[PDB]
Amino acid sequence: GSHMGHWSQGLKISMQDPKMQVYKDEQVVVIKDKYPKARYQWLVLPWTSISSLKAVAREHLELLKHMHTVGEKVIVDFAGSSKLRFRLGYHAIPSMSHVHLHVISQDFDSPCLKNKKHWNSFNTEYFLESQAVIEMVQEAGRVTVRDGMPELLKLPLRCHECQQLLPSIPQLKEHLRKHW
DNA sequence: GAATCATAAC
Ligand SMILES: Nc1ncnc2c1ncn2[C@@H]1O[C@H](COP(=O)(O)O)[C@@H](O)[C@H]1O
Ligand code: NA
Ligand SMILES: [Zn+2]
């Protein structure tokens, strides 16, 4: 099929769709995640095209910080009275093109969370904190990732709140209810 | 039987 129509290009289409946009400014857009893995999940994307964190440099440091500030503002404006915790960050190896910041609530209550890969992509070191990425760009000038990131996706299921080991996704989902 | 897992998408 075409390059423009390839599945990996889908964020470039969604980020221009008014029905998916929840915030816009001169630098970034925020969209709803199409397949949210928790009750709240947004993606913050720059208007300017940066393929992934592999292409980030110090010229982008202000932009990464702005993406983070905007993510925090979206939490306040859309979920400020929630008692939910949020994390902001980046998958160590993304699938979709165009750099994007995840802003995700920590309930992980969603039918789109279906497998161990989903769980571990948000609940191991595969999920890079936004602040950590920012500080790496500031101090080292680029984002690097160590070997072994795909292997993290195969780790046994473990609750992020209490560290209990769970044997299946259904049993993890039942367990997570206690932390609401 | 339920759930996981690797593989496939031309
Ligand atoms: N067309 C889309 N619009 C919005 N979010 C999307 C779309 N396609 C995939 N997603 C989400 O984009 C993210 C891509 O994951 P990653 O590349 O690992 O950061 C996932 O959270 C998906 O649910
Ligand atoms: Na992938
Ligand atoms: Zn727990």
Author numbering: 161 to 340
What does the article say, verbatim?
The APTX RNA‐DNA deadenylase protects genome integrity and corrects abortive DNA ligation arising during ribonucleotide excision repair and base excision DNA repair, and APTX human mutations cause the neurodegenerative disorder ataxia with oculomotor ataxia 1 (AOA1). The aprataxin (APTX) RNA/DNA polynucleotide deadenylase directly reverses 5′‐AMP damage (Ahel et al, 2006; Harris et al, 2009; Reynolds et al, 2009; Tumbale et al, 2011, 2014) and associates with DNA repair scaffolds XRCC1 (Cherry et al, 2015) and XRCC4. Environmental and metabolic sources of DNA damage prompt “abortive ligation”, the failure of ligase to complete step 3, and generation of 5′‐adenylated (5′‐AMP) DNA strand breaks (Ahel et al, 2006; Andres et al, 2015; Schellenberg et al, 2015). AOA1 mutations map to the APTX catalytic domain (Barbot et al, 2001; Moreira et al, 2001; Shimazaki et al, 2002; Le Ber et al, 2003; Tranchant et al, 2003; Criscuolo et al, 2004, 2005; Ito et al, 2005; Mosesso et al, 2005; Baba et al, 2007; Yokoseki et al, 2011) and cause variable age of disease onset.
H201Q: While His201 falls outside of the so‐called HIT domain histidine triad motif, it is highly conserved in HIT domain phosphohydrolases, including APTX homologs. Based on the structure of an adenosine‐vanadate transition‐like state mimic, it is proposed that His201 enables stabilization of the negatively charged transition state of the deadenylation reaction (Tumbale et al, 2014; Schellenberg et al, 2015) via its participation in a charge relay consisting of the main‐chain backbone of Lys197, His201, and His262 that hydrogen bonds to the scissile phosphate of the 5′‐AMP phosphoanhydride. The high‐resolution structure of H201Q (at 1.65 Å) reveals the effects of this substitution on active site chemistry from the histidine to glutamine mutation. In the structure of the H201Q mutant, although the active site undergoes minimal gross structural rearrangements, this charge relay is compromised, likely resulting in the significant reduction in catalytic activity and protein stability. Intriguingly, while seemingly well accommodated in the active site, the H201Q substitution also confers substantial temperature‐dependent effects on catalysis. Close analysis of the backbone conformations of the Tyr200‐Gln201 peptide bond reveals that a strained, but permissible deviation of peptide bond planarity (172–173°) is observed compared to wild‐type APTX (Tumbale et al, 2014). This non‐native backbone conformation in part could explain the thermal stability defect for H201Q. Precisely how the H201Q substitution disrupts the APTX charge relay system will require future NMR or neutron scattering analysis of active site protonation states.
